Ligand binder design. Sequence first.
Ligand code: NAD
Ligand code: NAD
Ligand code: NAD
Ligand code: GTP
Ligand code: GTP
Ligand code: GTP
Ligand code: GTP
Ligand code: GTP
Ligand code: GTP
Ligand code: ATP
Ligand code: ATP
Ligand code: ATP
Ligand code: IMP
Ligand code: IMP
Ligand code: IMP
Lengths: 519, 519, 519
Amino acid sequence: GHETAAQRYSARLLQAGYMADYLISGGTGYVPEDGLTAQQLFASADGLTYNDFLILPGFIDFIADEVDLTSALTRKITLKTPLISSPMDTVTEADMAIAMALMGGIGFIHHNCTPEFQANEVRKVKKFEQGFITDPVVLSPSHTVGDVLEAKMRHGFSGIPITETGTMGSKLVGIVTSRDIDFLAEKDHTTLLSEVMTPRIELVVAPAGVTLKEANEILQRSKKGKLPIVNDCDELVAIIARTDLKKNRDYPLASKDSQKQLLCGAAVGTREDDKYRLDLLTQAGVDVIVLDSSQGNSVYQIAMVHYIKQKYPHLQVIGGNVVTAAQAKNLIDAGVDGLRVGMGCGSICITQEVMACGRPQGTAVYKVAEYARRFGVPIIADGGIQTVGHVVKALALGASTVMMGSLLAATTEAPGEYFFSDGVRLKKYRGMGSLDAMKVKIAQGVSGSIQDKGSIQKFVPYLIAGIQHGCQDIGARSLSVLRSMMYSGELKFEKRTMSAQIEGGVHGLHSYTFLPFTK
Amino acid sequence: GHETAAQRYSARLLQAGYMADYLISGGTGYVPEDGLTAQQLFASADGLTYNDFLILPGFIDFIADEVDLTSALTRKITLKTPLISSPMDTVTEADMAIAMALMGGIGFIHHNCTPEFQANEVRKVKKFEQGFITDPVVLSPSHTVGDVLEAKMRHGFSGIPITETGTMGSKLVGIVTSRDIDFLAEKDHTTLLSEVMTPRIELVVAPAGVTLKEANEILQRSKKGKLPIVNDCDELVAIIARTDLKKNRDYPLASKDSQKQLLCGAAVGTREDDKYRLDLLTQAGVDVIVLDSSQGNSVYQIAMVHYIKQKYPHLQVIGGNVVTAAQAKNLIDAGVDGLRVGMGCGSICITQEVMACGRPQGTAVYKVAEYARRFGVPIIADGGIQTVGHVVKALALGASTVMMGSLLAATTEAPGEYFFSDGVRLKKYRGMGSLDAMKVKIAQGVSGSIQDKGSIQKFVPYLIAGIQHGCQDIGARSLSVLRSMMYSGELKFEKRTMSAQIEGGVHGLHSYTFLPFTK
Amino acid sequence: GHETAAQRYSARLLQAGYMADYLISGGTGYVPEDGLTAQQLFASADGLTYNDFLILPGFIDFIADEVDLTSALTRKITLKTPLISSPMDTVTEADMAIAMALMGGIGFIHHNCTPEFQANEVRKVKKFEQGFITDPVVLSPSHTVGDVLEAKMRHGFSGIPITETGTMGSKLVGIVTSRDIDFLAEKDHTTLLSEVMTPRIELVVAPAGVTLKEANEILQRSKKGKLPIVNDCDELVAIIARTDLKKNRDYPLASKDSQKQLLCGAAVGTREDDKYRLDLLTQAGVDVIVLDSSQGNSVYQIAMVHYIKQKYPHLQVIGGNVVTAAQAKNLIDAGVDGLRVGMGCGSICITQEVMACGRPQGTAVYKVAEYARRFGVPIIADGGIQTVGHVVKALALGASTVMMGSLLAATTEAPGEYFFSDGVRLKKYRGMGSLDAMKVKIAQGVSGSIQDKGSIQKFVPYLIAGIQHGCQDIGARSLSVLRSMMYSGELKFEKRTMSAQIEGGVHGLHSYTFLPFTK
Ligand SMILES: NC(=O)c1ccc[n+]([C@@H]2O[C@H](COP(=O)([O-])OP(=O)(O)OC[C@H]3O[C@@H](n4cnc5c(N)ncnc54)[C@H](O)[C@@H]3O)[C@@H](O)[C@H]2O)c1
Ligand SMILES: NC(=O)c1ccc[n+]([C@@H]2O[C@H](COP(=O)([O-])OP(=O)(O)OC[C@H]3O[C@@H](n4cnc5c(N)ncnc54)[C@H](O)[C@@H]3O)[C@@H](O)[C@H]2O)c1
Ligand SMILES: NC(=O)c1ccc[n+]([C@@H]2O[C@H](COP(=O)([O-])OP(=O)(O)OC[C@H]3O[C@@H](n4cnc5c(N)ncnc54)[C@H](O)[C@@H]3O)[C@@H](O)[C@H]2O)c1
Ligand SMILES: Nc1nc2c(ncn2[C@@H]2O[C@H](COP(=O)(O)OP(=O)(O)OP(=O)(O)O)[C@@H](O)[C@H]2O)c(=O)[nH]1
Ligand SMILES: Nc1nc2c(ncn2[C@@H]2O[C@H](COP(=O)(O)OP(=O)(O)OP(=O)(O)O)[C@@H](O)[C@H]2O)c(=O)[nH]1
Ligand SMILES: Nc1nc2c(ncn2[C@@H]2O[C@H](COP(=O)(O)OP(=O)(O)OP(=O)(O)O)[C@@H](O)[C@H]2O)c(=O)[nH]1
Ligand SMILES: Nc1nc2c(ncn2[C@@H]2O[C@H](COP(=O)(O)OP(=O)(O)OP(=O)(O)O)[C@@H](O)[C@H]2O)c(=O)[nH]1
Ligand SMILES: Nc1nc2c(ncn2[C@@H]2O[C@H](COP(=O)(O)OP(=O)(O)OP(=O)(O)O)[C@@H](O)[C@H]2O)c(=O)[nH]1
Ligand SMILES: Nc1nc2c(ncn2[C@@H]2O[C@H](COP(=O)(O)OP(=O)(O)OP(=O)(O)O)[C@@H](O)[C@H]2O)c(=O)[nH]1
Ligand SMILES: Nc1ncnc2c1ncn2[C@@H]1O[C@H](COP(=O)(O)OP(=O)(O)OP(=O)(O)O)[C@@H](O)[C@H]1O
Ligand SMILES: Nc1ncnc2c1ncn2[C@@H]1O[C@H](COP(=O)(O)OP(=O)(O)OP(=O)(O)O)[C@@H](O)[C@H]1O
Ligand SMILES: Nc1ncnc2c1ncn2[C@@H]1O[C@H](COP(=O)(O)OP(=O)(O)OP(=O)(O)O)[C@@H](O)[C@H]1O
Ligand SMILES: O=c1[nH]cnc2c1ncn2[C@@H]1O[C@H](COP(=O)(O)O)[C@@H](O)[C@H]1O
Ligand SMILES: O=c1[nH]cnc2c1ncn2[C@@H]1O[C@H](COP(=O)(O)O)[C@@H](O)[C@H]1O
Ligand SMILES: O=c1[nH]cnc2c1ncn2[C@@H]1O[C@H](COP(=O)(O)O)[C@@H](O)[C@H]1O
């Protein structure tokens, strides 16, 4: 479980110089009751959003850096950070999904594209970091230096083993890399690869049947960039690459599978066409699926959940969008591994004033997460996240992970180009029901634009530090402890009037210019 | 000289199927006279700035890519691009001066710092790209792997040759790079370098007395990252690095000296302390000096020019902001190698409303350049450059090179950090007389801010393409040809009314959003 | 006469190592001709104001601090600084007129008050600093301590010699100062002054007929605060105070008469009642008069000039507001000692759009000053002064002194109270024809308000440094040299288009925040 502020304070006193007290209660020391429990905050029957309340501070006995951010994404997937990139076309193709998985989150690739385009973007994510490279790019020695330059420009790899037949079943005859084609003149599409390859007699190679770690130490001490792995009959089984040891060293939080590939999610719809799409995504090695709709409690979605679970039984599935326990029930009972929570919140959205449907997002996260914990199901809080305070609030109210759109939009890894809208660098960010990119055909999104924020690799550690410092002022050692304090009634809340929201902001200053983080 | 639009058109006709005409004039064909000559434009005796006139289009017989942008900076320095970074604290330290020299321009490092700080920033520029590295980092084999990690942390160089003294006056015992320290655990500051160095029996080395091209080919075919150069007694004379062959390939315009180091300029003032400062800068290998002032026609500046030309007679000197021929005369006669032109123009200025002094910048560039060409002296047009049209206008009016402040400010290579003030990503940009960074002490600058523009290496090729397309539309094959057409009276101009400046902008559109450049 | 930039440069060359040239011209060296002469700038026959032109920079061979700002106010009055405070009720009563005279300018007290109020404000200016105090506060010994406190609260003078009769026509019996009444409790209005005065046997005194300097040395070595001056029969002739030696040390520019009193001016109108008002002002010891009217070329003003000159022939008179040489003629011919120049310029003014009359102020200063110098008459440039650049321009065009309203308004010495208008400290500033203060009775001014600027004693040295630095970039060693360069054609001007005025200011910065001066 977790240890109370009174228990922690009592323990820190017992570690220093400064009786019948244990017999009166014991462990349950006196704390004066102040603020509201989450049960009491939401018993009000009013629509509260992240701006309408505050979390009261606790007792601190740890540094903010010791705060554990480990989170369940689904019944079976754990991420080292609570952060998810939202499956939108102006947010997340492979560049974003790689950057999020490296920083210890995940991305879900968007589906405003062909099945083959989406499966190729998933395949680009899964190939970025590797244990054994088991389907390497291979060439026959009868190819040309111009074919190595073409391969480098088509895939992006220079380290190409050369086997007789030209596949990973033939016999190894050499390797080509950058430093044996890099200096070559315009005689590229004439010089045969046998003229440039480092020949198989020169190679450091390892016998096939070595663990990844044994092979890593062999590669590591060889001082080479590639190590070929070869069976008894001297045939190319796999390669490994020293840049993947560097990627490991460079990114200590990265979300990886057992093959040391980055985790990737993808979106699909609930149409009959989405089954073929799902077949290609599972061939591409996708780790988790979001089903993707305004209103997830439907016969169409409940059918698609049952199909995915009958066909790919090891695959993880997240339920659509829900905002009530009555919606969450039918999807949990259909057998989803997580739920996405939010309807009409989201910076680009107009669904509440178009459809009349939605819910205030603080209430929705609390009500759906409180229902879902009864079955062990994780919640994603989706949309309305404008600040690190909204992330800490979403997590404190019972969300396991937080999904962001506009906060990750106009980073360098978000799709498209900047275009300098109106005296500001200012990138495009749209919404998936925008009618800008998809019978009267009603819009539910608004095609806006967002200020430049630079790289995800510089912006996500600012989110992580803000979440850890928020947990420290609360007195929570981890996100699991934070949610345990909330369901126990130890975590206390205060409501805000309008003037309380105003005094929480910046007041009657003339000029105002905050710098977010400095490194 | 150059060939005229009539001559070019007549030659293009002679190349195709489509008499006594040559005898009437010959070569000088009829063109109807339209617009003004530059001498007529400025004979008006009104203060014209870059917005108050236009250049009329010519005859096109070449592609916008064939346009030669080569420019004289001084009597003896030529740059492959007309572009200079202004010596200001919020614009140009070594990161900017490296980026500008790589893209074929130059930077002048600012002097709002100590003599040792400025000479160290010059030394960082000169060390970034190298022919023979003659003063490499060297260690003795009695040093420890923790010293190599410290040398990487302090200097930035992974590849350290090892000699028995630990200096380049000694026999080479081997080499240490990253791939023989990169995997090491916390036993770094105990393990000796003799346990990790690739010994001199394993090395590829070349005999001292090779040319740089011979040494390049030896290094290149060796496939190693370093080649040590050694004398007859096996002592380390120099090293070369394949990193510099890559830098060369990657940056085809880069402004370099005979030692293959980047060119760097620096600023100094006209005080007695600037004599010592100049000595450190010349020890650091500075290529050119700006004497830096609001008003360069002074006894103090004319003394400093004579001092520099007596003490360092091979150093290049630029005269320090003149706007009249009468000012330019005394500095040209004192023996400067170029002039900086502009006074109280420049985005951060208040000099004209504080001092009453200045001149309108189109007029000043024309008057000073037309006087300076009589003596063969190049002009830098400085300040007021808001657009690529202002660059093309400055160059057409007789400037050899253009110096920019605010246009290069708030790039990634400009000094300082971004601070997200008011829904805009901004960087700090001030002016050198701004009283925010330096007797009543009057201000001449204003401490503003500028919006983010990303990297110089992405923004300067936009300037280059805009300058070449501007030349193509004019009908000029090079910037020398453009200035030759101007002094000959072939290049034609039109004055603009206020309404003409309005119709040259964007009109009564409701929304408006231009993408500057795409690829 | 002045010495030319060519002559100065040639002299600086003769001071260092760096023939027939003197014979070709001699002293008149070659300078390339650039810009316009003032004669040529105004020959254009368009209305130029201070914003429509610039002064071209010269040759510098002195530091900006060597610049002499000495100026003629009238035919017979000289001030150590060109600066005058404008006779308006929101600008100049005695506090402002003292502060301006101390910083080496002058103030003219306003006449929107009673004759006795104006003469009392003049008397407050004249009493602030003193040589011999010839009419001191004197009390008789039959008086109380309560009388000494009432005198201190009615005049402000704590040091009171005690003579028998209680007037200067009597024997001295002691002195009372603050230090021998300050500790007394509230039993004040009982105790006789003979109980508290330092008696005449204890006093250091000097014999009548000592010069002011001899008396200064006696007071100085005595270490006392006062020195009484006494005749041979031991009667009180005068006192002097060490406070005035401190004031003298503290204000080295202060505008003083031969009795070491500050200079003061006053306004009067041209009604019959102004004849009585003038008699009180001359009894108060006023130094100079303004005749204060929108249009000074009137039969009423020419009558009042002849009256003042026939009655008070030693008094200095400034003719009213003129903008043409044809107006200036009839007032110079009536016998004025200076002229005020400007009509409809002035920040609070509406005369041009109400009356159709006025003139552009650059043209008016030039045309009136060029006419007035033929007779040796000084010009005051009045109104439209927004910057130190406008002061330098007005002086360069031929004004001897500059008179300011809105620039001195909302200082601490300007009349009235601050009242914090709209989130800014913001004081009132009205105009004298404003109908806010005073048959349809037409308004000619606009009852506005101005930002706080602190003390005149902190703001006028900023003006002085700005004027001196402006003269230095022009190459003028004094204001007389600046006007000599202008009438000779050595001083050169450039006109400004609209875009030229725009590039002289601050450009497309996002934020902008200049600090005027730092001390
Ligand atoms: N969460 C929100 O607040 C919200 C609101 C609007 C849109 N969106 C987003 O925009 C996108 C579009 O959402 P959507 O709800 O319009 O997509 P959707 O395809 O789920 O629903 C659109 C319509 O198609 C119907 N439909 C779906 N599957 C069907 C099937 N098999 N047979 C017949 N009809 C079927 C639905 O009932 C609905 O009427 C998604 O990316 C979604 O996440 C989100
Ligand atoms: N070009 C412009 O329009 C412009 C205008 C204002 C300021 N600036 C910039 O701001 C900075 C400061 O310019 P500045 O003109 O104030 O610097 P500066 O050092 O040239 O001049 C400052 C003052 O010191 C004096 N001075 C200079 N050397 C002297 C010496 N040896 N002995 C005595 N006095 C001496 C000058 O005459 C001047 O009064 C520079 O970076 C300059 O480029 C540029
Ligand atoms: N300088 C300016 O541009 C300007 C413009 C308007 C007002 N003011 C100021 O307003 C204040 C009021 O003065 P004013 O400008 O109204 O002019 P004013 O008070 O001198 O005269 C007002 C009117 O009365 C007339 N008048 C003056 N003396 C007269 C006499 N003896 N007999 C008969 N008629 C006589 C004038 O001709 C005019 O019509 C002054 O402080 C003046 O300087 C200044
Ligand atoms: N060479 C190679 N690398 C692959 C392949 N599939 C994935 N990769 C990844 O691509 C990277 C290797 O790129 P290379 O071009 O071979 O050369 P490198 O020096 O190892 O990597 P860089 O430093 O990025 O150039 C590693 O991160 C591999 O995991 C493949 O078929 N061949
Ligand atoms: N070749 C290769 N080896 C890896 C990779 N990631 C981990 N390993 C190896 O497996 C070991 C696993 O230990 P860690 O590095 O602590 O755990 P990790 O989660 O796999 O990797 P990190 O992302 O660095 O935490 C490493 O020491 C490496 O030897 C990878 O991408 N490629
Ligand atoms: N080691 C080394 N060799 C260089 C460097 N720059 C040029 N060289 C070599 O010197 C020769 C110069 O030819 P270029 O490269 O065509 O001309 P460059 O002006 O020196 O370099 P570019 O900037 O590429 O034009 C070639 O053999 C280059 O490989 C450098 O930084 N380091
Ligand atoms: N090794 C080394 N490089 C130097 C030195 N002075 C300048 N350099 C430059 O530093 C750069 C990188 O040096 P290294 O770290 O040794 O070589 P590198 O491994 O190719 O550099 P990266 O690939 O960028 O890590 C080259 O461009 C050299 O020209 C020096 O003393 N030693
Ligand atoms: N008591 C007295 N003596 C003064 C005063 N002003 C000047 N003096 C004296 O008269 C002599 C004048 O010398 P300065 O003070 O250098 O010249 P100044 O022109 O009178 O005054 P400044 O312009 O203020 O320097 C000195 O002996 C002064 O001490 C004053 O207000 N009171
Ligand atoms: N005492 C006195 N000072 C006068 C008189 N008329 C003008 N003053 C001026 O007022 C100042 C002297 O004021 P005091 O009240 O005597 O006191 P103080 O000696 O200045 O001492 P503090 O006011 O405390 O600095 C000097 O500058 C005098 O020139 C007068 O009748 N008596
Ligand atoms: N396992 C190996 N055994 C022997 N030689 C190898 C092996 N792997 C690569 N080589 C050779 O080593 C040299 C360097 O290749 P490596 O992969 O280490 O660097 P690279 O990626 O090509 O160089 P760089 O990083 O500078 O671009 C090449 O000549 C290559 O053919
Ligand atoms: N001239 C040389 N002769 C022989 N071996 C060398 C030579 N120069 C470097 N080495 C050795 O070759 C190996 C690779 O070094 P190299 O400089 O080529 O790559 P690196 O820059 O260290 O590799 P990386 O780019 O991956 O960081 C190291 O073990 C190094 O000690
Ligand atoms: N000429 C003089 N000879 C002798 N005593 C004097 C003379 N002038 C003043 N005194 C006496 O000297 C003492 C100090 O006088 P002073 O004028 O310096 O006092 P003050 O101005 O009130 O002092 P403070 O500046 O501290 O307030 C008083 O007791 C005063 O009566
Ligand atoms: O067009 C749309 N209409 C309605 N909701 C949308 C639309 N597109 C995406 N969303 C939701 O908006 C969320 C992102 O919200 P944001 O982080 O506040 O910008 C997504 O994850 C979706 O749940
Ligand atoms: O404080 C200052 N006042 C006036 N001119 C300055 C100041 N600092 C720099 N400058 C000039 O401003 C130029 C840059 O102008 P910009 O490119 O328009 O932003 C510089 O190269 C200098 O000549
Ligand atoms: O009410 C008014 N109407 C017209 N002109 C005025 C009025 N009051 C003062 N002035 C003029 O305005 C000048 C001050 O102008 P300023 O310095 O620009 O504010 C004064 O010296 C007068 O000449």
